[PDB]
Nucleic acid binder design. Structure first.
Length: 183
DNA sequence: GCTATAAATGGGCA
DNA sequence: TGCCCATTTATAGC
């Protein structure tokens, strides 16, 4: 399953769900305490809960974004809590089309990387402009996953909708990181 | 904190 | 017609 012997740690999950009922954001921001609505800046009510530690963006359309959870289950669970709070506030909220939209993972290969050599050998996939951002941007095609590679050996993997894509992206890159280990 | 990465949502605006 | 708007999270160097 994880030939490298390293398993990327899931750090952030963004999911979305349709409450399937229009919402009065101004009424939600007044009644709810764990909220903050400033439409001139963003069209959403920003709500937060302690467990699972997450943040929700609630829109008048009934659409909702859930960010911050450390697992897919935690995300859905948190999304359900927001929906219940909305329901309790007075709206006929449902839990329609729950979908995991992005999973962010990270791991440490515990060895330094020669980013410039890696970038040069994989120019079709890399973007390494150290003066702007210190990490190399590797946009993997299969699976379609973006990996941020640092000299420290620390790797961030994002864009996955299924955790196995995160795991696969890593396993695919491992041999490449090894080939360019900084000695 | 800013730089960069992915993803979803929306109001505004050239 | 597209783009930033704000939110989250790991990462590291101004």
């Amino acid at each position: 399953k994880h030939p490298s012997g390293i398993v990327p740690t899931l750090q952030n999950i963004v999911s979305t769900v349709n409450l399937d009922c229009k919402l009065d954001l101004k009424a939600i921001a007044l009644q709810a305490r764990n909220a903050e609505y400033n439409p001139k800046r963003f069209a959403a009510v920003i709500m937060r809960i302690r467990e699972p530690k997450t943040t929700a963006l609630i829109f008048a359309s009934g659409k909702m974004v859930c960010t911050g959870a450390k697992s897919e289950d935690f995300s859905k669970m948190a999304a359900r809590k927001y929906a219940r709070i909305v329901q309790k506030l007075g709206f006929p909220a449902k839990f329609k089309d729950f979908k995991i939209q992005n999973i962010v993972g990270s791991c440490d290969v515990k060895f330094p990387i020669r980013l410039e050599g890696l970038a040069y050998s994989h120019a079709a996939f890399s973007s390494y402009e150290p003066e702007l951002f210190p990490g190399l941007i590797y946009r993997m095609k299969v699976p379609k996953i973006v990996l941020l590679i640092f000299v420290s050996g620390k790797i961030v993997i994002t864009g996955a909708k299924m955790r196995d894509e995160t795991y696969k992206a890593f396993e695919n890159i491992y041999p490449v990181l090894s080939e360019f280990r900084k000695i």
